[PDB]
Design a protein around this ligand. Structure first.
Ligand SMILES: Cc1ncc(-c2cc3cc(-c4c(C)ccc(O)c4C)cnc3[nH]2)cn1
Ligand SMILES: Cc1ncc(-c2cc3cc(-c4c(C)ccc(O)c4C)cnc3[nH]2)cn1
Ligand SMILES: Cc1ncc(-c2cc3cc(-c4c(C)ccc(O)c4C)cnc3[nH]2)cn1
Ligand SMILES: Cc1ncc(-c2cc3cc(-c4c(C)ccc(O)c4C)cnc3[nH]2)cn1
Ligand SMILES: Cc1ncc(-c2cc3cc(-c4c(C)ccc(O)c4C)cnc3[nH]2)cn1
Ligand SMILES: Cc1ncc(-c2cc3cc(-c4c(C)ccc(O)c4C)cnc3[nH]2)cn1
Ligand SMILES: [Cl-]
Ligand SMILES: [Cl-]
Ligand SMILES: [Cl-]
Lengths: 274, 284, 284, 274, 284, 274
């Protein structure tokens, strides 16, 4: 039966929903409009709430909980998302629940990922658009880092467009509360030395941005991959970009964490206000 | 500098080849192979089609993206070699020539295989000759009978991890999740694929039978040209041994009939590779 | 028309006998056997004492009531053949001569056995010679040692599924629930008998030891001429290794003593057939 | 501890019952008078409620729940029984509960099964008695079928006499709600073709009745078994029966489901009113 | 009077020795051995250093405090003999010469071993030569490879149950909790030690890998001269594969590196003895 | 999350304790002052309640519940301790709870065990001290036996000094309610014959006392061990003891349970009042 899942400690009710009928709460409480993703995790659906008639995205897990490591891992993501709270540059969880060991996360409906969007574009992607996504994501970072949180998976796949283009940060499954693994492609190098902080996310975002700005897939290994983490920009990757944008990325990809700019620090720069 | 990675180890762990000079700054992989193409790229790193400068033969070499990111990462990467080795040579199992590390980077050199079943069957329509399927079925069953006889379970049987070999013979690959039954213990499989998972895994315990289901689904998927259910009702039905007519139709009663045996929800009633390979429709 | 059912299969699956003409409308079973008596009837169908017209020898043939009612039904029925075959020949295990199907009807032909222990001991009072028991004990232990050595577990050990053979030698039968450990995986046994079940089965996981308990109870039941508890307090006590005096009394300290070893609640401390058959009171 | 089991979504209380004492709720809340059955499932007891001093039958499961398939299967039977509701020709569940993974169903005390009763009789069983059992069971069927339910196990073992002989239908463990296996002896033939409906139960009842009317055990296989499912009455099985009764059974055993009479249709016939 | 206890049994169960006269009221143990010292005393009873009057050789004889206190007690005591026997002879496994009972008292005669690792390393400081450790590591790994090859799991691997042998060779002992995988079934280990327990045991199921973790911790403990966490945060960290710097430091990267492989939380990724003994640092 | 564990059938609250913080209830609700024991079971800590600022001892289990046999066995001890109730010669449980499958028992802080204390003494242990411990423990026994309870593990390890020396009986994990194993060293002989009662505990206490009085470790086997259970006092073990004390122990170590004195009977003797 449906149980609200929240770390702000719990039954659910809605129009369209009759506990005695066989169909699930999800099945009964929403119209399914499209499938926005699918893979290991399950499926993401475009849904209209029969409660309010508003659009949302719901994430359904594929199989029931396989055990505690599956359950714990799955439920961590809610705990995380909640700890983030409401921010206009961070994907918003309306509510979560389980029914038959299946986990559903109800969020604000976001548009495509930056990866999808920039892919659909050519390399003719306006540097304007980029700056917007940059500021927009730094704001998301600035918000998380100030709360003592590191996302650890900052990449175009995990960043979605809102209505009016404002880009928001999502997939908080790998988010950690400092004190209490991520994509090797966007991995910060301090991580290889067992050391991490908020800096990590800034590096990843540096690369998130370099990738979409250049419309060049980032190296999957070899010398290419090392160079970036020794703060070397390939001229192959720095053409068609404003001396302004390039200089910023240099400061985001500074190999020394202790020397790498902050989100707040970056959002202080003239090019990154308004 | 290049350390051989093997659990059948030897006091010959320094690596040598034609075209390789240690005093040159290039890596062994850069010096020792001609990269002819890239066959894959993802989280794991990259796979290249390469010519050996030593023996001039063609291979696949999987190179890991970053160095070892940590103890778990190192263990996970090395476990694949350990597994791949436990399998041994079988004509229906991807052969590993050798594995080595250099500055924390794991390289696996295997025989060069064609594309995965996923790719191959994607590339066919539902025009896929049911004949080819039986081939794939038999060829993978043989691989399993070989693994299962040796008390090994793969736990990642799927069209993605099944590659086409010399002529038509399809090879079972990606021994990342393979376990030796009795070593680990039948417990929760964390990093498994739920799309192909056997029902008994949801209750924690498993056996070889697990792989037979997974192959059931693997074959069903490619046989139908249908993507398998990613959750909800559809997904549970297959693990309660219901064949939703949308799939079962288009497939000879003969083929239809077998998959049933493979998809029996009860591991204890589910056919073995040994047993299935005894049926006439799957011999020679 | 008659298709042989075997998982040691062959390209000789069409069936032939003296007295069998394919062009006659009678079934192979009707044509090929003289039915001398009916030894059983229930849900499963029927068992007949029959003379082979081929070799004139006496057998038991179990014929299934209906055709295959569905995929589960077909699988369940065929799994018994598969199991019965995995057992092999042992003087203390019911021998299968052959299995076949015809219009969806499964027939199992075994050696002709006498009545089950249940029947035989029912028919005795508590006048049952304790001597006979040891025989049954030893004879069934041998059967288990044979199964367990081969990594097989029966999971349906009970006086109902134990039949008397040529002279006195009691045979273990009904391999319907038998599993190959490592194939299925130690998980919930759905269609088991709780009256003889080992405690460890309530916690999902099991081993060969399971059968030893079941035989513990099997022997206890017939040794006492007492029906075993069908639930409540009485039932839990046996699986917490308490011997309620109402049973333990009337049985030689020697016999009493052994059943204890067999009924140890902890599979990890419970005796093996191998080990028990080493004790002097159970040799030759 | 005792938990009410009901799909009409739950603690229990009674005289004789002290939560602090070791003995179970069942042990404490009833006197045990006889054992009415025993087998795979556990035991059925004749009980006097210490609450009301009224007679009931309680069904105790033998072992604790062996796992989810055991628990689910066991609990299905309650769900089923509830969905049936109160009918004078259907066995009545007072309440169900579990305590230490043991499942108890409390029903109205029924007399013996038709199988027991007709066995205890000879073949001298009045055709009168039969008609009563026939009408009585059709009523049970008529009630279930109108609610969209198929019993799937309609046989003399699963039909009990009430006080004043009125025969009631029981064992709803195999009952299914159309939309959302049975005895081969009483199995309808459409079932062999993957097709089922309410008709199934009518066929089974046709055979339930043929059996007790003839005091002949029904074929366990061979040609005997097939014939019936090709609508052939053996003259061995149709002697000593009224042309009336025989004709009815013909209509109940019509091999084509789409051609087989309904409970309502049958209860409309002159011989089957009063 | 003295009955030999063996599950490789024989029709020679009455016991005889030089210095033993049955008609004397003294026990066999009192008559047949010279007690030279007491090597242990606890709940179990007592262990003595003894000279055989038969063969004049030195042994350890463990004598049980009371007679058999009950069926569980008898079973528990006899299971150790049964296990100790299943192990067989291995130079790195404590050898049992014989076991016998007399008036309900179980005696186990083994080779005479030196002190346990616990004692030996207690008696050293952190001045313990890391060299000795590798020896102990390798020597115990060999013991496990021997057990694991034979489908046996010890489930009580710890410095207490590891004794020093002829010269330096450390021997694995106390086979009280040892189980034969497939006999019992992977289920809850009641009388286990949580201080050395592998994580997978908390989820009910296990394999040989269990012992490798336990040895991981065994070696970590003695390598550090640190007592292991008896609960709270500290205890869970080791079973989630975190090496709290307080331990990991002071140990060669080489040694540090290996323990990681042994302490991998995921049994399915955790190294085998076979595999570890292949690494150069652990050969000859 | 924290759940009160009691068989008097349950959330917990306290100062210092914030449900949202990561640290456990135990971690948050107490200061840890010393570790009083450690072994198989886990650890015993000297704690100051942040609630009341009073001293207690808490017993933490080492690993989460390993399964039902581990959980049941662990929880039995609470059930037991509760059934004992409040007595000045019996260790007092304030409360118990679990959090993350870890079990905590909160008791009155006791001083060292008799084993510890008498060990720390020589054999110069005043016979006075002994008598006090004897009476004090008989009172504990008298209380338990009158309630139909046998402790089954009566030894110097399981008996602690209170403030003002009054010795109290603890570790009720092996306590049984007559109707509804112990240390072989202090084992009563009837036990070897499958028979037990309240007498058992009296024998064990007879030996508990003999041991500390003599400052001699009790035989671990051989003839030594049998003799005591055939009511034979070794002169090695009866020197330096008052004819009074010796005679008492004879009556406590009477091999025949049916002939062995009671706690009440013993507490009736002149030497054992005040
Ligand atoms: C073409 C196209 N493709 C995909 C999308 C899309 C994916 C998506 C995922 C979430 C989400 C959910 C649902 C749960 C947790 C969580 O962190 C997130 C980010 C929300 N909105 C989304 N929109 C839109 N358009
Ligand atoms: C179009 C196309 N796409 C992909 C391929 C291809 C991928 C591939 C991977 C391995 C391999 C490696 C390299 C390491 C470990 C391991 O388990 C395996 C299976 C071997 N042969 C391969 N061929 C060919 N053609
Ligand atoms: C009074 C009396 N009652 C019953 C018998 C009897 C039943 C019986 C069943 C089989 C058999 C069959 C036929 C198939 C599969 C299978 O596992 C088995 C054990 C073999 N021999 C039998 N003898 C004899 N006498
Ligand atoms: C000689 C004799 N033998 C047996 C009986 C008898 C069996 C019986 C079973 C139920 C019952 C129960 C208890 C639970 C669920 C359920 O569907 C049912 C039908 C109710 N009343 C019964 N009476 C009477 N007389
Ligand atoms: C200082 C000191 N302390 C302890 C010893 C010591 C204890 C010991 C126990 C056994 C033994 C026995 C006797 C029975 C069963 C069994 O598994 C074992 C391992 C064998 N050898 C031993 N040596 C030596 N020196
Ligand atoms: C030197 C020294 N060492 C140890 C102690 C000491 C141990 C101890 C154990 C409990 C206790 C607990 C905590 C739980 C359940 C239970 O039955 C009991 C008896 C209470 N108080 C104690 N004090 C004092 N001084
Ligand atoms: Cl793959
Ligand atoms: Cl049977
Ligand atoms: Cl030990």
């Amino acid at each position: 039966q449906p149980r609200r899942v929240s770390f702000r400690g719990e039954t659910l009710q809605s129009p369209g929903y009759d506990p005695s009928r066989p169909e699930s709460f999800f099945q009964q409480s929403f119209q399914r409009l499209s499938r926005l993703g699918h893979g290991s995790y399950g499926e993401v659906f475009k849904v209209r709430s029969k409660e309010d008639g508003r659009l949302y995205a719901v994430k359904r897990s594929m199989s029931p909980f396989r055990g505690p490591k599956d359950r714990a891992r799955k439920l961590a993501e809610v705990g995380s998302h909640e700890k983030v709270g409401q921010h206009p540059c961070c994907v918003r969880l309306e509510q979560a629940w389980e029914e038959g060991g299946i986990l559903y996360l109800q969020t604000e409906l976001c548009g495509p990922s930056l990866q999808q969007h920039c892919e659909a574009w050519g390399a003719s992607l306006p540097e304007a658009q980029v700056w917007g996504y940059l500021r927009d994501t730094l704001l998301a970072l600035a918000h998380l880092h100030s709360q003592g949180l590191v996302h650890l998976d900052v990449k175009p796949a995990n960043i979605f467009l809102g209505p009016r283009g404002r880009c928001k940060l999502g997939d908080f499954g790998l988010l950690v509360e400092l004190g209490t693994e991520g994509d090797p492609r966007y991995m910060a190098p301090e991580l290889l030395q067992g050391s991490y902080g908020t800096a990590a996310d800034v590096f990843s975002l540096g690369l998130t941005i370099l990738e979409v700005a250049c419309n060049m897939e980032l190296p999957h290994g070899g010398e290419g991959w090392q160079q970036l983490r020794q703060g070397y920009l390939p001229p192959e990757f720095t053409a068609g970009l404003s001396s302004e944008l390039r200089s910023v990325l240099v400061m985001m990809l500074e190999p020394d964490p202790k020397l790498r700019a902050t989100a707040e620090a970056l959002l202080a720069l003239p090019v990154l206000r308004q």
